Design a protein around this ligand. Structure first.
Ligand SMILES: CCCCCC(=O)OC[C@@H](COP(=O)([O-])OCC[N+](C)(C)C)OC(=O)CCCCC
Ligand SMILES: CCCCCC(=O)OC[C@@H](COP(=O)([O-])OCC[N+](C)(C)C)OC(=O)CCCCC
Ligand SMILES: CCCCCC(=O)OC[C@H](COP(=O)(O)OCC[N+](C)(C)C)OC(=O)CCCCC
Ligand SMILES: CCCCCC(=O)OC[C@H](COP(=O)(O)OCC[N+](C)(C)C)OC(=O)CCCCC
Ligand SMILES: CCCCCC(=O)OC[C@H](COP(=O)(O)OCC[N+](C)(C)C)OC(=O)CCCCC
Ligand SMILES: CCCCCC(=O)OC[C@H](COP(=O)(O)OCC[N+](C)(C)C)OC(=O)CCCCC
Ligand SMILES: CCCCCC(=O)OC[C@H](COP(=O)(O)OCC[N+](C)(C)C)OC(=O)CCCCC
Ligand SMILES: CCCCCC(=O)OC[C@H](COP(=O)(O)OCC[N+](C)(C)C)OC(=O)CCCCC
Ligand SMILES: CCCCCC(=O)OC[C@H](COP(=O)(O)OCC[N+](C)(C)C)OC(=O)CCCCC
Ligand SMILES: CCCCCC(=O)OC[C@H](COP(=O)(O)OCC[N+](C)(C)C)OC(=O)CCCCC
Ligand SMILES: CCCCCC(=O)OC[C@H](COP(=O)(O)OCC[N+](C)(C)C)OC(=O)CCCCC
Ligand SMILES: CCCCCC(=O)OC[C@H](COP(=O)(O)OCC[N+](C)(C)C)OC(=O)CCCCC
Ligand SMILES: CCCCCC(=O)OC[C@H](COP(=O)(O)OCC[N+](C)(C)C)OC(=O)CCCCC
Ligand SMILES: CCCCCC(=O)OC[C@H](COP(=O)(O)OCC[N+](C)(C)C)OC(=O)CCCCC
Ligand SMILES: CCCCCCCCCC
Ligand SMILES: CCCCCCCCCC
Ligand SMILES: CCCCCCCCCC
Ligand SMILES: CCCCCCCCCC
Ligand SMILES: CCCCCCCCCC
Ligand SMILES: [Cu+2]
Ligand SMILES: [Cu+2]
Ligand SMILES: [Cu+2]
Ligand SMILES: [Cu+2]
Lengths: 227, 239, 231, 239, 231, 231
C-alpha cells in the first residue's frame, strides 16, 4: 500500500515480480490460499541499498489477517532469512490461512537487511466468516497437539496477575500510613526514622524471602512440567 | 492556624498525599515507559525475541534506570520504602494497557504473542535491600546483582510453555519461533531479530547465566550513575 | 480546597474519542496516503489540531493577566493552602496528559510501525501522537508552571530549575521528531530501540523526572503550613 | 584624573573600541573559519556538493557554534546586540578572500563553482531574537529552529540557476554536476561526494525540508551547549 | 598613546611576499619533491624559517629583562593608560597573525589538495602553512602575553587562565600536525571535514576564543581608569 | 611498634604453593575440561576456595567486635603511634596481595590465553586468578580498611573517600569478570588489549591509585605526631 511513496527509480531497479498467480480471491476463515511466481534480482542494484546477502520473504498485510502457513523459495521452506545473488531468478510460493474477515490488499514483499521493504504487486482478497472460528492446531515433538491461538495463555495471565498483586500489596502495606507531609516534617526535623520500625523492616524480609522462594520453586516446577 | 482543628490538617495532608501520589505515578509512568519502550522493548514486544543472550542482557540494564533515580529522593527526603515498586507498577500497567487494547484490540496480534516482560521480583528485592542497610553503595552493588540475576528466573515460568520444540514442514522450531513465523509483522523482518545465534567462542549452553551475570555487573554501574542523576532531579535550586 | 475541576478531567472523554476515531476512521480509510479519503479524515485533522493547539496555548497561558501581589506566605493556611491545592490539581492534569502522550500513544505508534506502515513519508498514528498528544501535554505543563509562577509565593524567586525540566524538557521531544524521520531516512533502522535515532527523545523521558524537584519544593513551603497542627 | 578633560576620556574610549573590535573580529574570524572549514566545508567548497540532505543538515549545525559562544559574553557583559552578525561577517569575508584569491586566482577554478554558503539570514534573526526576550533558553529554542530552517531558503536563489537539468552524452545531469565533471579535482574523486542518493526508506522529494527540521532541532542543543562553553571562555579566573 | 608601531604592521609586506613567492616559485618549480629545484626553493626555505623562528622567539621574548616594579594601578590614567594602548597594539598584531595563519593559509592548503597534491610524504604549501604562519602567530601571541605579564599591574596576580588559551591553545595545532599526516597515512581520508583526523586542530580554533577573557579583563581595570571622566 | 606480623607474610609460601600446583597439576592434568582428572584437581579446588574465602571474609572482618572508644588523638605518640604502625602493616599485606592478584596471575593468565587454551567455557588459569587471588586481595583490603575505621581516631569521621577506591574499586574487577567471558563470547576478540571487552577491568587498575589518598591522610595526622620531635 505504501509502495506509492517509495523512490520511483528504486521501485524500478531492484526486484521484478512476474508469473504471479493468486489461487483465490474469496476465502473463508480457516481456509488457505497460495501466491506463487518468480522474481528476478536486478544486477544494476541501487548503491544505497545493501546487496541482498540477508533477505526475508515477507507478506504485506495490515497485521495478521492471514497467517503465513508456509513459504518456499525454490522448493525449500524459508522461515529464516536467506541470501540472494544479483542477476538471478528465483521461484517462490507462499501459503496463507485466512484469519480475520474483511477486504485486504495482499502484497508479496522482500525485506533486505540494510535496504528496506521491496513491495511487489498487491491483490484484493476478501475473507468471510467470523474470527472466532479460527483454529491453529499444532503437534509438538511430544504430541501433545495444541492450539497455537490460545495455548499457554492462562499461565501468562496467572503469573503476571500474581506478581502484580504482590507488588500492589507491598505499596498497600505503606499506603495506609499517612505519606509525604508527616514524612517530610520528620526527616526535616531529624527524625529520619519516620515509619521504618523493626516490624516494618521484618515485613521487608518476608517479602524478600517469599519472593526469592517463589522464584526457585517456580523454576523447578517449570523444569518438571516442560522437561 | 485558620483551617479549623488539628485533625482538619490530617485530612488536608491525606487529600494532598492522594493527589501527589497520582501525579508522581503517572508522570514517572510516562517517562519510564517511553525510556524503556525506546531502549529495550523489541525483546519486550514479541515472544520470539525473548532469547537467552540479548534479552537477559538488555532488559534489566535499561530497566533499572528510573527505579534508581526516583529512589534518590523518595528515600532520603521522606524515607519512602517503595519507589522502585511504584516505577515497575507504572511501567507494567502502561505496557499491559497498550498490549491488550492496541496490539491485540487494534491490530489483532494474539496476546500470548506480545505479553510484556516481568520486572516485579527485582523491584521488590531492590526496595527491601534499600530499606535495610540504608546504603546507596551497598544497595548499588547487591541490588544491582539481584536485579540482573532475578530477571530470567522470574520470567522463565511464563515463557517456558512456548519453548517446546516443534517440527514444521521439515524444520525444527520452538512454538515462539512458530508464532513469529505465522503472525506476519510486515515491519519486522526476521533478520532484524537480535537473538543469540551461536559463535565459535560460545559454549554449548552458557548464554542465559553468563548474560544474567554480565547484566548484574552492568546494573551495578547503572544504579550508581542514576542514583546521582536522580539526586540532581530532586534539586530545589532556582535560576 | 479541591474536589471540583479535579473530577472534571475531560481528558478521558476526549482521548476516548480519538482511540475510537482511530480504530474506525484510520484502519483502512487511512492506510494509504493516496489523495481523497486520507486528506479528508487525516490531513484536515492535522491542520485543525495544529491551529487549535496554537490558539489554545496562546489563550490558556494568560495567568500573567490574573497574576498580582502573591504574598500568600504572609497569609494563614487558608488562602495559600487553597492555592497549593489548585497547583496540585494542575499537576494531576499534567500527569494524565503526560501519561496519554508519552506512554499510550507512543507505544501505540510502536505497535503501528510493526504491523504494516513503514514510516516512509508519513503515518496516521503519529498525527495523533506527535501533533495531538505532545502539544496537549505541553500546554498542560506550561499552564501548571505559569500558575505556580503567578500565584504561589515560594515561586516568586526566579524560575525553579527542576520545574523547567518537567516542562520544556518534555517539550524537546516535539522538535526531536526531526531526529526521527531523518534517522528513519538515510539513517533508518526498522526498530524502536537499537536505532540510536530514537535516543533523541529517550533524552526526554529522563527530563520527565523533574517532578522529583517540583515535589520537593511543594513539600517544603507546605511542610511549614502544617507543622504547628501536627496531631 | 591626569589625562586632560572628560571629553579626552571619550576619545580614549573610542580609540580603544576600534582596537578591541579589530582584534576580536580577526581572532574570532580565524578560529571560526578553521572550525567551519574543517567540520563542514567540502559542501561549502563545491556547488556539486550543495545537496538537499547532508549540506542542509551539516552547514547550519556546525555553523551555529561560534555565534552562540561569542554571544555568551557579548550580551551579558556589554549588552552587544550583534556578535552573531560579527561572527558570520568574519567567516564570509575569510571564505570569499580565499575563494577569489586562491581557489580562482591560484588554481583557476571558476568562481561560479566554488562560491561559499550564505549564513547571513540566520545570523540576523538570531541576533534579533536575542535582543528581544533577553533569554538564553528562549533564544536557544527559537533561534536554533530559525537558523536550521532559514538556511536552504536563504541559499536557494543563489544555487537555483545551477540546478537546471541537462542531457550530456546520453546521461542526465544538472549544471552543478556538469561543473563537477568538467573541472577536474584530482584530489576529490566523485565517490567521496556525500550527497543525497536515495534509499528504500526515503520518500520521493522530502529531503530538503526534513533535513532543515532535523538541523534546527540539533541546532537547539548545539546553541545550548555552546552558550555555556562561551560563558566559560569569558572567565576572568587566574591560576 | 598609540598611532606608531600600530601602523608599522609589516605583516602585510612579508605575507604579500610569500603569496607571491608561492605563485611564482612553487607552482611548477615545487610540484615534484624530486631532488634539485625542490630542495633549492622549498627545503632551504623550510630550514631557514625554522632556525630563524626559533631564534626570533628566543630573542623577542625578553620582556622579562625589561620587566620591573609594575604598580601602574597606583599611577594615574597616563602611565598605565599608556601601557594598555601598547598591550592592545600587541593584540592587534596578534589578530593579524592569527588571521593569516589560521584562515588564509589554512584554507589555501585546503585549496592545494583538491587540485593535485596528495599529501603523500609532503606538500610545499606546508612549508608556508605549518612551519611559517603558525610559529609566527605563536611568537606574536607569546610576545603579547609576556608584555601584559611584565608591564600591567592587573596581570601581576598569576597567569590569567583565558590568556593562556588564546595562547598555548592555538599552539596545540602545531604539534597537532602529527595527528594529520598520520590520519592522512594508515587512517587517511581525502577531505578536510568528515575525516576526524582533522578534528584534532578543530580543537584549536575553539581555543582561539580566549580573546573573550582577555577582553573582559582588559575592560575591567580600564573601566576603572575612565569612570570618573564620564562625559 | 612493628617487626612482628610484618615478617609473618605467609603470602609467599601460599602463593609459592599454587605456582607449583599450577605447573605440576594443571599443565596436562588440567588441559581438558573432560570429566575425571579436571573435576578432581581443578573443580574441587574452585569449590573449596570459594567456600573458604567466603567464610574467611565473614570471620576476619570482625574488627567491629574489637572496635571501641578510639580517641587515640588525645593519647601521646605511643598508643596512636603504635596503631599507625599496625595500619601500615595491614597496608603492606594489601600491597603484596594486590601485586600477586593484579600483576602476577593476571599476566600469567595472559600468557595462558596465548599458548593453547581458548577461553571457550573455561580455563584453569583463572580458577587461580579470578576466584583465588582477587578475593584474597579483596579480603586483605577490606581488613585494612575496617582496621583503620575501628582503631584510628582520624578515621572516625565517616569513610574516607579515597580509601573506598583502593578498596571496592579493585573489587569491581571481580564482577567485571562478567564483561569478559561475555565480551569473549558473542563479542570476542582474541587479545588482551584492543578488545574493549577488557576495558572493563582496565577501569579497576586506575581505582588501585586510591593509595595516593590513604597516604595523604596517614601523613597528615602522623605529621602532627612527629612535628615537636624534629631533630
Ligand atoms: C544500550 C543498551 C541497549 C540494548 C540494545 C543495543 O545496544 O543493541 C544490542 C547490542 C548492539 O547491537 P548492534 O547491532 O548495534 O551491534 C552489533 C552487535 N554486537 C553484539 C556485536 C555488539 O549491544 C548490546 O548488547 C547492549 C550493550 C550496551 C552497552 C554496554
Ligand atoms: C559532526 C557534523 C559534521 C558533518 C559531517 C559528518 O559527520 O559526516 C556526515 C555523516 C557521517 O558520515 P560517515 O561517512 O562517517 O557515516 C556514514 C553516513 N551515514 C549517513 C550513514 C551516517 O553524519 C552526519 O550526517 C552528521 C551528523 C552529526 C552528528 C549528529
Ligand atoms: C534463583 C535461582 C534459580 C536458578 C535457576 C537457574 O539456574 O537458571 C539457569 C538458567 C540456565 O538455563 P540453561 O543453562 O538452559 O539450563 C536450565 C534448562 N532450562 C532452561 C530448561 C531450565 O539461566 C538462568 O536462569 C540464569 C539465572 C542465574 C541465577 C543465579
Ligand atoms: C550526567 C549526570 C550529571 C548529574 C550531576 C548532578 O547531580 O548535578 C549537579 C549540578 C549542580 O551541582 P550542585 O550545585 O553541587 O548541586 C547538587 C544538588 N543537585 C543534585 C540537586 C543538583 O546540577 C546540574 O547542573 C544538573 C546536572 C546536569 C543534568 C544531568
Ligand atoms: C542539557 C542539560 C541542561 C542542564 C541545565 C543546567 O545544569 O544548567 C544550569 C544553568 C545555571 O545557570 P542559571 O541559574 O540559568 O543562571 C542564573 C539565572 N539568573 C540570572 C536568573 C539567576 O541554568 C540553565 O541551564 C538555564 C535553564 C535551562 C532549562 C532547561
Ligand atoms: C484543561 C483544564 C485543566 C483544569 C485547570 C484547573 O482546574 O485549574 C483551576 C484554575 C482556577 O484556579 P483559581 O484558584 O480559581 O485561580 C486563581 C484565582 N484567581 C484566578 C481569581 C486569581 O483555573 C485557572 O486558573 C484558569 C482556568 C482556565 C482554563 C479552564
Ligand atoms: C510543521 C510541518 C509542516 C507540514 C505541512 C503539511 O501540511 O504537509 C504538507 C507537506 C507534504 O506534501 P507532499 O508530501 O508533497 O503531499 C501531501 C499529500 N500526501 C499526504 C498524499 C502525500 O509537508 C511538508 O512540507 C513536508 C513534511 C513536514 C516536515 C516534517
Ligand atoms: C521561509 C519559508 C520559505 C519556504 C520555502 C520552501 O518551502 O522550501 C521548500 C524546500 C523543498 O524543496 P522541494 O520539496 O524540492 O519543493 C520545492 C521545489 N523547488 C526546490 C524547486 C523550489 O525546502 C526548503 O527550503 C526547506 C525549508 C523549510 C522552511 C520551513
Ligand atoms: C565542555 C563544556 C564545559 C564548560 C564548563 C565551563 O563553563 O567551565 C566551568 C569551569 C569552572 O567552573 P566555575 O568555577 O563555576 O566557573 C564558572 C565560570 N566560567 C564559565 C567563566 C569558567 O571552567 C573550567 O574549568 C573550564 C571548562 C573546561 C573547558 C571546556
Ligand atoms: C583540556 C581543557 C583544559 C581546561 C583547563 C582547566 O579547566 O583546568 C583548570 C586548572 C585549574 O588548576 P590551576 O588553577 O592551574 O591550579 C592553581 C594554580 N596556582 C597554584 C598558581 C594557584 O588549571 C589548568 O588547567 C592549568 C592551565 C592550563 C592551560 C591550558
Ligand atoms: C613584531 C612587531 C610587533 C610590534 C610590537 C609593538 O608595537 O609593541 C611595542 C613595544 C614597546 O612598548 P613600550 O611601552 O615601549 O615598552 C614598555 C616600556 N619599557 C620597554 C621601557 C619598559 O615593543 C616592545 O615592548 C619590544 C619590541 C621588540 C620588538 C620590536
Ligand atoms: C621537525 C621535522 C623534521 C624534518 C626534518 C627534515 O628536514 O626533513 C628531512 C626528512 C625527510 O627525508 P626523506 O623524505 O628521506 O628525503 C628528503 C628529500 N625529499 C624532499 C626529496 C623527499 O624528514 C623527516 O625526518 C621526516 C618528516 C618529518 C616528520 C613529520
Ligand atoms: C592475613 C594476616 C595479615 C596480618 C594482619 C596484621 O598483622 O595485623 C595485626 C592486627 C593486630 O593489631 P593490634 O593492634 O593487636 O589490634 C588492635 C588492638 N586490639 C585488637 C586489642 C583492640 O591483627 C588484628 O587486628 C586481627 C588479626 C586477625 C587475623 C590474624
Ligand atoms: C559463581 C559462578 C558459578 C559456578 C558454578 C559451578 O560450579 O560451575 C558449574 C557450571 C558449569 O556446568 P557445565 O559447564 O554444564 O558442566 C561442568 C563440567 N565441565 C567442567 C566438564 C564443563 O557453571 C555455571 O553455572 C556456569 C558458569 C558460571 C558463570 C560464569
Ligand atoms: C556532592 C556529590 C556531587 C554531586 C554528584 C555528581 C556525581 C557525578 C559522577 C557520578
Ligand atoms: C552518521 C550518523 C551520526 C549520528 C550522530 C549522533 C546522533 C545523535 C542523536 C541525538
Ligand atoms: C552556573 C552554571 C554552571 C556552569 C555551566 C556548566 C554547564 C555544563 C553542561 C551544559
Ligand atoms: C583508530 C582511530 C582511533 C582514533 C581515536 C580518536 C582520535 C582523537 C584525535 C585527537
Ligand atoms: C555491542 C557492544 C557494545 C558495548 C558497549 C560498551 C561496553 C562497556 C564495557 C564496560
Ligand atoms: Cu496495498
Ligand atoms: Cu511513527
Ligand atoms: Cu596539506
Ligand atoms: Cu582467562
Amino acid at each position: 500500500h505504501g509502495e506509492k511513496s517509495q523512490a520511483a527509480f528504486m521501485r524500478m531497479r531492484t526486484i521484478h515480480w512476474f508469473d504471479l498467480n493468486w489461487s483465490k480471491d474469496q476465502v473463508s476463515v480457516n481456509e488457505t490460499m497460495s501466491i506463487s511466481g518468480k522474481f528476478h534480482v536486478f544486477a544494476g542494484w541501487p548503491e544505497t541499498v545493501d546487496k541482498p546477502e540477508v533477505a526475508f520473504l515477507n507478506i504485506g498485510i495490515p497485521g495478521p489477517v492471514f497467517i503465513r502457513a508456509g513459504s518456499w523459495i525454490g522448493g525449500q521452506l524459508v522461515p529464516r532469512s536467506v541470501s540472494l545473488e544479483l542477476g538471478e531468478t528465483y521461484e517462490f510460493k507462499v501459503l496463507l490461512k485466512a484469519r480475520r474477515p474483511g477486504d485486504w490488499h495482499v502484497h508479496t514483499m522482500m525485506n533486505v537487511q540494510g535496504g528496506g521493504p521491496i513491495i511487489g504487486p498487491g491483490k484484493w482478497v476478501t475473507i468471510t466468516g467470523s474470527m472466532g472460528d479460527f483454529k491453529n492446531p499444532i503437534t509438538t515433538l511430544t504430541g501433545e497437539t495444541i492450539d497455537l491461538e490460545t495455548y499457554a495463555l492462562d499461565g501468562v495471565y496467572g503469573w503476571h496477575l500474581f506478581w502484580y498483586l504482590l507488588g500492589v500489596a507491598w505499596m498497600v502495606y505503606w499506603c495506609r500510613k499517612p505519606v509525604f507531609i508527616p514524612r517530610r516534617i520528620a526527616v526535616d526535623a531529624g527524625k529520619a526514622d519516620s515509619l521504618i520500625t523493626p516490624t516494618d523492616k521484618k515485613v521487608g524480609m518476608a517479602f524478600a524471602a517469599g519472593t526469592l522462594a517463589i522464584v526457585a520453586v517456580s523454576m523447578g516446577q517449570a523444569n518438571e512440567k516442560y522437561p | 492556624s485558620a483551617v479549623r482543628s488539628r485533625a482538619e490538617a490530617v485530612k488536608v495532608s491525606r487529600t494532598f498525599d492522594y493527589m501527589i501520589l497520582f501525579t508522581v505515578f503517572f508522570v514517572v509512568l510516562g517517562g519510564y515507559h517511553i525510556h524503556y519502550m525506546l531502549t529495550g522493548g523489541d525483546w519486550d514486544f514479541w515472544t520470539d525475541w525473548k532469547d537467552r543472550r540479548l534479552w537477559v542482557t538488555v532488559a534489566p540494564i535499561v530497566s533499572i534506570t528510573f527505579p534508581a533515580a526516583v529512589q534518590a529522593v523518595l528515600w532520603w527526603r521522606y524515607r519512602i520504602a517503595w519507589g522502585a515498586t511504584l516505577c515497575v507498577l507504572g511501567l507494567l500497567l502502561g505496557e499491559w494497557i497498550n498490549r491488550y487494547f492496541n496490539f491485540w484490540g487494534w491490530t489483532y496480534f494474539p496476546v500470548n504473542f506480545v505479553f510484556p516482560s516481568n520486572l516485579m521480583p527485582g523491584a521488590i528485592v531492590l526496595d527491601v535491600i534499600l530499606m535495610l542497610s540504608n546504603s546507596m553503595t551497598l544497595t548499588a552493588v547487591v541490588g544491582g546483582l539481584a536485579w540482573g540475576l532475578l530477571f530470567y528466573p522470574g520470567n522463565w515460568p511464563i515463557i517456558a510453555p512456548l519453548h517446546v520444540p516443534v517440527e514444521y514442514n521439515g524444520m525444527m522450531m520452538t512454538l515462539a519461533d512458530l508464532q513469529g513465523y505465522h503472525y506476519v509483522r510486515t515491519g519486522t523482518p526476521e533478520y532484524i531479530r537480535m537473538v543469540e545465534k551461536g559463535t565459535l567462542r560460545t559454549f554449548g549452553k552458557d548464554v542465559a547465566p553468563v548474560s544474567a551475570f554480565f547484566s548484574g555487573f552492568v546494573s551495578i554501574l547503572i544504579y550508581f550513575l542514576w542514583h546521582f542523576f536522580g539526586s540532581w532531579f530532586g534539586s530545589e535550586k532556582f535560576v | 480546597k479541591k474536589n471540583i475541576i479535579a473530577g472534571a478531567s475531560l481528558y478521558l472523554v476526549f482521548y476516548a474519542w480519538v482511540r475510537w476515531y482511530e480504530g474506525v476512521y484510520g484502519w483502512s480509510a487511512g492506510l494509504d496516503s493516496f489523495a481523497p479519503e486520507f486528506e479528508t479524515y487525516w490531513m484536515n485533522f492535522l491542520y485543525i489540531e495544529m491551529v487549535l493547539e496554537v490558539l489554545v496555548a496562546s489563550v490558556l497561558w494568560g495567568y500573567i493577566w490574573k497574576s498580582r501581589d502573591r504574598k500568600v506566605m504572609s497569609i494563614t493556611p487558608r488562602e495559600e493552602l487553597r492555592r497549593h491545592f489548585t497547583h496540585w490539581t494542575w499537576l494531576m492534569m499534567y500527569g494524565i496528559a503526560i501519561y496519554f502522550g508519552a506512554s499510550y500513544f507512543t507505544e501505540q505508534d510502536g505497535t503501528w510501525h510493526q504491523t504494516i506502515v513503514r514510516d516512509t513519508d508519513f503515518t496516521p498514528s503519529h498525527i495523533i501522537e506527535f501533533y495531538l498528544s505532545y502539544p496537549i501535554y505541553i500546554i498542560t505543563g506550561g499552564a501548571s508552571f505559569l500558575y505556580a509562577k503567578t500565584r504561589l509565593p515560594t515561586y516568586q524567586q526566579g524560575l525553579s530549575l527542576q520545574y523547567l525540566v518537567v516542562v520544556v524538557g518534555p517539550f524537546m521531544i516535539l522538535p526531536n521528531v526531526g531526529l526521527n524521520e531523518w534517522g528513519h531516512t538515510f539513517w533508518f533502522m526498522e526498530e524502536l530501540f537499537v536505532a540510536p535515532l530514537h535516543y533523541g527523545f529517550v533524552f526526554f523521558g529522563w527530563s520527565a523526572l523533574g517532578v522529583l524537584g517540583v515535589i520537593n519544593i511543594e513539600l517544603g513551603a507546605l511542610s511549614k503550613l502544617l507543622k504547628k497542627d501536627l496531631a
